[PDB]
Design a protein around this ligand. Structure first.
Ligand code: NAI
Ligand code: CL
Ligand code: CL
Ligand code: NA
Ligand code: ZN
Ligand code: ZN
Ligand code: ZN
Ligand code: ZN
Ligand code: ZN
Ligand code: ZN
Ligand code: ZN
Ligand code: ZN
Lengths: 336, 337, 341, 337
C-alpha cells in the first residue's frame, strides 16, 4: 500500500517522483483519491523556498487536487465515501478566532495550507479536513473543475471585493490562467468587462469570453488613457491578476475616482505608490487571494451552471519539473 | 470699497497684505464677512506652487474661512445676512456627473477649490456659492469652529472609510492638527483608540483626549509589533494623518489582517508597497481627504454637541509668512484683530 | 396657442381629452414636446384617488412622458432644443436636505411629482425642471424607452435594495408593467429569477423574459410553499410589484432566512405581518420608491445596451379610459405607451 | 450522582423541582457547573408550549446559564476545566450550510436551542457544545454577566442591524430587561438615544443610562410626533424591545424616511403594516433576536470594559414558578445561595 507522489526533497532542486506511503486518516480526517491536480504559481514558489514563511521538506505540493473520497476517519459526519471533493489552499483553520467566527476564515492566523505547510495534491492520495474540502459538481470533468479551487475562487472573490455592481466597468488586467476565468465571472456578475494584456491572442480570447473593450499594453503607448476613454473616465474596478510593476502602475491610471483596485498576485519586492494621487482621487487598493469556503461553493456553482469554463492544458505528474520550466489557461495534471 | 487680503503674487515668495477691492456677489452667489480663517498645509503648497495642477497668481489662499453672510446675490434661497457660514475646500461642483449625483461631489472632476482655483478666506470678505458653504453651529466660537472645515471633516471622513464599527481598534498615526481631532472623533464613534507619534507630549495629549494605548514611534524598538500586541493582532483601522515614509511603513505593520489603512495626507513622491503582504493579509489601503457637504455637516454637529474641540493657536492675517515658516494643534487667524 | 391633454376632472370618473394652454418655460425651466407617454398604474391610483395624499383635480397625469426639448428658459445650462428627455415621477427635489445631500433625493420631503402634484405627460407639451429629467439613449425608440422612466427605474432600484448578489434567487411578484421589466433587470444583474402572478399568460411572459421558476397564486393555494421548494428554502430577495395586498402577505413566505422583501406596489391599505416569523427568521421588509437621478441614468443604460427591453403596445391619448379598463381588468401584457405623434 | 433541576413535565403546568441524573459529556462535549441562570420570556413560552415549534417535554429550560466548565469530553481542543463559560440560545449549528459558512449561524435550519430543543441551564449542570459556548470576562460576577447571553446580545445585534452610524438618533422602545441594556449599548455605539415607555420610572432610568430624549407613550397623546420633533424629523433607527400593537404602530411613526425599525420580540398574531407608508417613506422593518457567536463576544466585551451593566434581581431555582407568575430588569437565579 504505497502511492506515486511528486516530492520536494530540497528547495530549488527538481522534484523527485517517489513511491511513498498512502497517508491514512485519523479522527476528523478523510482520504481522497486524486483524479486531477492543478498547478499554481504558488506551487513553484513552494518548491523554490522563495517566500518568508517556507514549507518543511520533504513535502508534496498542490492545492488544486480533486477526486473521490476513498476513506473516512472516525468522528466524521456528513462527508461519505465516493463523495466528489477538492482540497484547496485553505486546509484548515482554527474555528474560534474573530476571523473564523465572522466569515473570514481565509485570514485565520493559525490556518494550514495544502501543499505548503501540509502534504497536498501532487499525488494519488491526500489526507484532508472534511470541514474545509470543496464539494464538486457532478456535471463537470475533474480536469476542468480543478482550476476553480485556486484560480477560480481567487478571481471570483477578487471581483467581489472591487465593491462594484452590475452595469459598472471592471478592467481585468492579465488574461492568463486567472484572468481568462475572471472575464467570465465578471460577465456573469453583470459587469461590463475591459481586458488588458501584452499578447493579442489573449485579448482575442478575452473578447470571445465576453470582454467588449480590449487594449494591448505593449503596443498602445498609453493604455490607461485608452481605458479611461472607453469607460467614460475610468473603471469602477480593476482586478490585477499578474502584478508586474508596469501592470500595477497602469492599473492605477485605469481606475475612476472613488474606484477600487483589487490585487491577486504574490510578486516579490516593493512597488511604488503615489499616495498623493490615491488621496486626491479617493482610490482604494486592496489585496485578495483565494476565498472562504462559501466563496469556493459560490465559485463552483458558476462552473456548474455553465457560466464559467477554464481553458486547460493537461499533463502527467511526471511532467512536473518541465511544467515548472514552461511556467518560468491552466495546467492540470491528470492522474488517470 | 476695499478690504485687507493676503495675496500670493509669485510662487515661493512672501505673501503681501494688500488693499484689494471687495468682491460683490452676482446671481446665485453670497458674500461672507470672514471672522476667523484657518491655515492648512495645502495653503502652503498653494503659495509655493508645489503641485502638478497649480493656482493662477495673484490669488488669495484659505479654505477654512468662517464668518457672517454680509450680502446675498440675486435669486439665492434661504440664506440671509447674519447667517453663520464657512467656505471649505469644495467651493462648487458640477451637480450633474455620476460622482455629484451619487452624493460623492468631493470627487467631481469639475470642482473648484477655495483658496486654490478661486480666491479664499485669507481676507476680510469672500464671495461663495451658497449651495456649498458649511452652516456653522451658533454655540461655537469662530476661532474654534474654523478647523472643522478642513482638518475636522478630513479626519472624520477618513475614519468613516476605515469601515470600522464601535468596539473596534483604530490607530491614529500623528497627533498634530489633524490627529488630535481624529482622536476625539474616533472616541465619539465608539472606537477604542491607539495613538502613535514621535513626541511624548503629543501622545499625552492623545491620552487626555481618550486614547487608551500610546506608543512613541522613535523610542520603541518595534512600534508596529507593540500596537499589534495591544490590539490583539492589529487595528481594524489605521488613520495616517502625517504621511512620512516611516509612518506609512509602520502603519501597514499596525493593521490587522482584513483591516484598512486610511490615508489623509498629500506627501510628494512614491512610497513602497509590499503587494505580497497586502495580498497575504487581505489589507485595504485607501485615500481620503476633506469630504462631502453632508460629511461636513456631520462633522460640525460633533463640534456643536461638545464631542470634538480643536486646540488652536491664534494669529493675525499680518502674521501669515511667519506662520508658514513655523509650519515649515491648528493655526487660526482671527480677523476681528 | 393650445394643446391636447387628458385631464382628470373628478376621481373615479372618465378623463376628458381637452384643448388646454401650452405651458411655457420660465427661468430654470424647459419645455418638452411629448412623443410617447407610458401609462403607469400610479396614474390609475391618481385618477381613482386611491391614496391617503391625493392630487388636486383638474390635473394631467403621466410620469413616463418622453420627447424632444422644444424650448429652453432663461439661465438653463447644457440642455438644448432637440435633446431627447423624459420627465419622471421625481419632478424636482430641494438639493439641500440630508436626503438630497446623501444620495437619497427620492426621500426629499419637498419634492414635486410629475402627473400628480404638477401637470404631467398625458399631453403634447410638458414644462420640466431640467435638473431632474432623464437623458434618453438615442438608439431606443420613444415608445420603447418610455416605461424605463418609472417602471424600469423603480424595479431596478427595488432590486438594488434587496441586498442580493449575482447567483442569488429573487422572486418577482406581479409580472405587469413593473414586473416584466423586473424579470429582465434581475437577469442582467446576475440573479436567478422566480415569478409569481395570478394569470398564466403573465407567467408565460416571465418565462420568455428569463424566469425559470413560475407559480400561479390564483390556482395554487400556497404559492410561497412552492417557491421555497423550488429555491432550496426560499429566495434571498423578493420584489413585490403587485397591486393586491394579499401578494404582499404571501411574499413574506417566499424569502429565505436572512432574506429581504422589497416593496414597490402601492395598493391602498395594510397587509398582515407576522412579527414572530420575521424575527425568528431574520427577515427584512423594505419600501422602495422610484429611483434617484443616478438610478434613472443607470436604468436607462441597461435599455441602451440591449439588456432590457419593455414589452409595449401603443395606444392613443384618446384611448386612455379604455387603457385604464384594460389595466384594471389585468389585460395588459407588459406596458401600454400612448403614441402622441 | 444527581442534581437539582427545574423541569417542565407538561406544558402549562407548574415546573417541578426534581432530582435528576447529572448529564455526562460525550465526545465533542463539555459539562458546565452552573452558578447563575438568567430567566427570559422565552423560557415562559417554552414552558407554556405557546410556539409553533415546541419543546419535547420533559425538558429543563434556560439559555442564560453561566458557570465553570466541570468536565471535558474527548476530542475537545481549546476549552478546559475551570473555564468561565455561558451556554446561550444557540446550542449548536450544522457548520456546513450557507448560513453557517457565511457567518450567519443564527439562521441555521438545523440549530438546536438551549433550554428549548435540548436541556438548558435551569439546573446545576449542563452538557454543552464547546464550539458554541460564550467565554465570560474574568472581571464580571456571574449574576451580572448572565443577562448578556440573551438580553444583551439580542439588543446589541438589534442595534447593529438598524444600519445607523455614530451621531444618528436611535429610539429604544420599551425600557425593561432588554431596553435598559439597549440604552447603554446605543450610547457606547456613539448614537444619540431617545427612549419610549409607559412608565415614568423606566424613563428616568433611561435618562440615568444616557437617553437624552424621553417620552411617556401613555401620557403623551402622540408620542411619535413628539419623537419626530425632538429628533429634527425622526430617528434613523428604532429598536422595539417590547412589541405590542401600540408600540409597533408608534415605532413606525418615529422613524425618519429611509430609517430602520429593528424588532427584538416574539409577539403572537399579525400586525398591520401600511404598504403606502412603507414605500413612500423608504422605510425598512427588520427582525433580529440573539446573535452569532461573534456578536455575543462583542457584546461581552462591552460588559468587560464597563460600558454596559445589567440591573438584575436575584432569585433561587425553587422560586422559578413564582418568578413566572411575577412575569405573567432581568431576573437571574443564583445557584450558589
Ligand atoms: N414604488 C414605486 O416607485 C412605484 C410603484 N408603482 C406601483 O407599483 C404597482 C404596479 O404597477 P404596474 O406594474 O404599472 O401595474 P400593472 O397593472 O401593469 O401590473 C400589476 C400586476 O400585478 C399583478 N397582480 C395582481 N394581484 C396579484 C396577486 N395577488 N399576486 C401576484 N400578482 C398580482 C397583476 O396580475 C399584474 O400583472 C402599482 O401599485 C403602482 O402604483 C409604480 C411605479 C413606481
Ligand atoms: Cl474560447
Ligand atoms: Cl448575467
Ligand atoms: Na494532507
Ligand atoms: Zn481562526
Ligand atoms: Zn494557488
Ligand atoms: Zn460633478
Ligand atoms: Zn485643507
Ligand atoms: Zn431635499
Ligand atoms: Zn409610475
Ligand atoms: Zn448550518
Ligand atoms: Zn432569551
Amino acid at each position: 500500500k504505497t502511492m506515486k507522489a511528486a516530492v520536494v526533497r530540497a528547495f530549488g532542486k527538481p522534484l523527485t517522483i517517489d513511491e511513498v506511503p498512502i497517508p491514512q486518516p485519523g479522527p476528523g480526517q478523510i482520504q481522497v483519491a486524486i483524479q486531477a491536480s492543478g498547478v499554481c504559481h504558488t506551487d513553484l514558489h513552494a518548491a523554490e523556498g522563495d517566500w518568508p514563511v517556507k514549507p518543511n521538506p520533504p513535502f508534496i505540493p498542490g492545492h488544486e487536487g480533486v477526486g473521490f473520497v476513498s476513506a473516512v476517519g472516525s468522528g466524521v459526519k456528513h462527508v461519505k465515501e465516493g463523495d466528489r471533493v477538492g482540497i484547496p489552499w485553505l486546509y484548515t483553520a482554527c474555528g474560534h478566532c474573530r476571523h473564523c467566527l465572522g466569515g473570514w476564515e481565509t485570514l485565520c492566523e493559525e490556518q494550514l495550507n495544502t501543499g505548503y505547510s501540509v502534504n497536498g495534491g501532487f499525488a494519488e492520495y491526500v489526507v484532508a479536513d472534511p470541514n474545509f474540502v470543496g464539494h464538486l459538481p457532478k456535471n463537470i470533468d475533474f480536469n476542468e473543475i480543478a482550476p476553480v479551487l485556486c484560480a477560480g475562487v481567487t478571481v471570483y472573490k477578487g471581483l467581489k471585493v472591487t465593491d462594484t455592481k452590475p452595469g459598472d466597468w471592471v478592467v481585468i488586467s492579465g488574461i492568463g490562467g486567472l484572468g481568462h476565468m475572471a472575464v467570465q465571472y465578471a460577465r456573469a456578475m453583470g459587469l461590463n468587462v475591459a481586458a488588458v494584456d501584452i499578447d493579442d491572442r489573449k485579448l482575442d480570447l478575452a473578447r470571445r469570453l465576453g470582454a467588449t473593450v480590449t487594449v494591448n499594453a505593449k503596443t498602445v503607448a498609453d493604455p490607461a488613457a485608452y481605458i479611461r476613454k472607453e469607460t467614460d473616465g475610468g473603471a469602477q474596478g480593476v482586478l490585477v491578476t499578474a502584478v508586474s510593476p508596469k501592470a500595477f502602475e497602469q492599473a492605477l491610471g485605469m481606475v475612476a475616482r472613488g474606484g477600487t483596485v483589487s490585487l491577486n498576485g504574490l510578486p516579490p519586492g516593493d512597488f511604488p505608490l503615489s499616495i498623493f494621487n490615491m488621496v486626491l482621487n479617493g482610490v482604494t487598493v486592496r489585496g485578495s487571494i483565494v476565498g472562504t469556503r462559501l466563496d469556493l461553493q459560490e465559485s463552483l456553482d458558476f462552473a456548474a451552471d455553465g457560466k464559467v469554463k477554464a481553458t486547460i492544458q493537461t499533463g502527467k505528474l511526471e511532467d512536473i519539473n518541465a511544467i515548472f520550466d514552461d511556467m518560468r489557461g491552466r495546467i492540470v495534471m491528470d492522474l488517470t
